[PDB]
């Protein structure tokens, strides 16, 4: 018995991460990913530093000494083959310790910053080493844009799976069609914590709103009328962290949130703050509210709260997916 | 048997961007998945022929991803020409619908001409109806030298369209392979 | 099923031949629609007969463009030879029709071998056809050919088993597609 799962969702939602977790779960190369991890690191610091003078109001450095390091970073920003001299890591680390740089980082939702920014900058001392070996979590956090369609195959209890990973950005979506025919089920990934952010494509469209429009496009599509959708409400960790912080209020981006109460049948995790419960379920309902409008039994929607960078959470939710495929005879 | 006609309107509707969309990989089954979409596109165009307002439209064939059709084969002596332009608008609606569900942005490029043609079957293999002539050649040139989202017509075709209440904008004089300098117009939508 | 049933099947190890008239638009601008059709029917009827004699399956006729494939429907290891022999007879037939008609007819011939997808598209007016990068290449080989000669690719030459004498094609310098794709062409003597 073989199943063909397709991964859809907007860019940076976590699709490629889900595929990686499949290898760590159901399936020498770490030496090539190092270069990518360093690029993420470089890209992270330069983006924060470049945004400082462009924000309204601008963010000032806490240490005038670091102004020279800022000048340093900006000069090498477009260097094709960067050789990463030990100097770079020193300057980068010093900037990351500057309070000004931190305050700018806090307002990262006001510009385009990769998700692994904080993860890598906190371990510069680890990556700088010439004998550095990437951990599992490092490879999971490493971000590299997907362009084209990739196929991954794995077995789970003698059951075959063919997982297709595609690009989530606008220009790439034109390729999805090539995987619509005879798809066992679709896995729609959503970056739940991206409610206070806008897409890269135009710098205006709200990231969560884009997710919603895209889901409505897939759920109501003419060639997917009988195809069920497994909805991964990804980035649960960043969602909770944001909700608790209290700086960005969900109701400032999605007004309707002010009239939302937690459903009775809600199953919160042990020790989970009510505010987090209320937020994660609100987001789930915005998506369910679309899946409810049409379909009429010829296909359903199966929600799941998810954190792709957690092999623990993924093993659990994917097992739940395994059950859905088999008991529904898909 | 071949039959002559004096006033038949021919149309060639292309999708210039399809060739680029088409690729062969192990994921798309050596281009089969791409052809699956072309089949959906042609099918939606073919379904317009059943609309009562298009009963006078004859689909001749499909060259690759180009759609070839004609009106006036079942013969305001000129209304059939205006109808051909109405059919070209409807294809755009159908292609826009496909784009919506396939996350693409395919655009149609039309060319229309009118005049005498010869209709019938040719060769010795299969009974395939077709139309020939300089009129059919020029219609096709109006497509290949056309612009995306535009309908390019010839001078006399433009005059007929105007009598029917159509606005046309001069594209200028272009050197058409085999014909030389021809003045052509763009229909105003 | 939400996708229309597709009537398409894949086929490996086949050959594709294209043939096209040189300056057909210029020719159709000189003689009556009747003459053009009589001349064109005199030519293609013979081709169609020559097709069956050479185990070639005629696909379709696009005005002045004539094309067929070998290895279809049923497989045949003699494929490359069939198209080569088909071109041979074709070029000769063109010369006879040129003599008794008086019309200046000349055609370029092109051949390539590889895989294709074949069948039909849409709902109305079905017509057997072929699609694939290899088919696209064969089409360009014709465009990059020479008046009254058979232009073949290296891929096709490897199926010929050395039964025909060829010479450097230099198609790269006659057609942009052939160059950008690093194609090595030849010309059968
Ligand atoms: N903290 C956190 N980071 C996550 C989570 N899921 C994914 N990420 C990170 O977000 C980034 C983007 O994820 P990725 O998988 O690359 O997106 P994508 O959907 O494949 O993106 P694309 O190819 O359409 S452009 C990666 O750095 C990844 O590690 C999550 O649940 N929590
Ligand atoms: C459908 C896609 C693709 C790529 C497939 C293909 O091989 C073609 O259909 C051929 C070559 C092929 O079908 C043979 C006939 C003809 C008429 C020569 C085609 C056109 O040139 C198509 O392009 C156009 C412009 O319609 C092309 C190239 O399109
Ligand atoms: N019934 C038809 N079906 C499809 N295409 C047609 C039909 N009638 C004519 N055509 C087309 C439009 C013009 C084209 C013939 O001209 P073509 O573009 O081959 O050039 P040409 O013959 O003038 O010059 P050349 O072949 O030397 O470049 O074939
Ligand atoms: Cl998203
Ligand atoms: Mg990706
Ligand atoms: Mg031609
Ligand atoms: Mn020609």
Instruction: Give me the strand/helix succession of chain B.
Output: EHHEEHEEHEHEE
Judging from the principal axes of the Cα atoms, what is the shape of chain B? Answer: globular
Strand order, largest beta sheet of chain A: 2-3-1-4-5-6
What's the CATH topology label of the largest domain in chain A?
Rossmann fold
Q: What is the CATH homology-level superfamily of chain B?
A: Nucleotide cyclase, GGDEF domain
- As a percent range, the share of helical residues of chain A equals 40-55%
Largest interface: B-C, 45 and 40 residues
How much of the residues of chain A is beta strand, in percent?
5-15%
Portion of residues in beta strands of chain B equals 25-35%
Number of domains of chain B: 1
CATH topology call of chain B: Alpha-Beta Plaits
Cytoplasmic side (chain B): 1-189
Family (chain B): Belongs to the adenylyl cyclase class-4/guanylyl cyclase family.
Subcellular location (chain B): Membrane; Cell membrane; Cytoplasm
Region (Interaction with GNAS) (chain B): 27-44, 101-104
Can you walk through the features of this model?
The complex is a heterotrimer of chains A (330), B (189) and C (189). Chain A is globular and about 65 Å long. Chain A has a six-stranded mixed sheet with strand order 2-3-1-4-5-6, sandwiched between helices. Chain A has two domains: 214 residues, Rossmann fold, CATH 3.40.50.300; 115 residues, GI Alpha 1, domain 2-like, CATH 1.10.400.10. Chain A is built from twelve helices and six strands. By secondary structure, chain A is α/β, with parallel strands linked by helices. Chain B has 189 residues and is of the alpha+beta class. Chain B has a single domain, classed as Alpha-Beta Plaits, CATH 3.30.70. In chain B, strands 1, 2, 3, 4, 5, 6, 7 and 8 form an eight-stranded mixed sheet that branches. The longest helix of chain B has 24 residues. The radius of gyration of chain B is 17 Å and the shape is globular. Chain C has one domain: Nucleotide cyclase, GGDEF domain (Alpha-Beta Plaits, 2-Layer Sandwich), CATH 3.30.70. In chain C, strands 1, 2, 3, 4, 5, 6, 7 and 8 form an eight-stranded mixed sheet that branches. Chains in contact: A-B, A-C, B-C. Chains B and C meet through helix 2, strand 2, strand 4 and helix 4 of B and helix 1, helix 2 and strand 2 of C. The complex binds 5'-guanosine-diphosphate-monothiophosphate, forskolin (FOK), 2',3'-dideoxyadenosine-5'-triphosphate, chloride ion, magnesium ion (2 copies) and manganese (II) ion. One magnesium ion binds next to helix 1 of chain A.
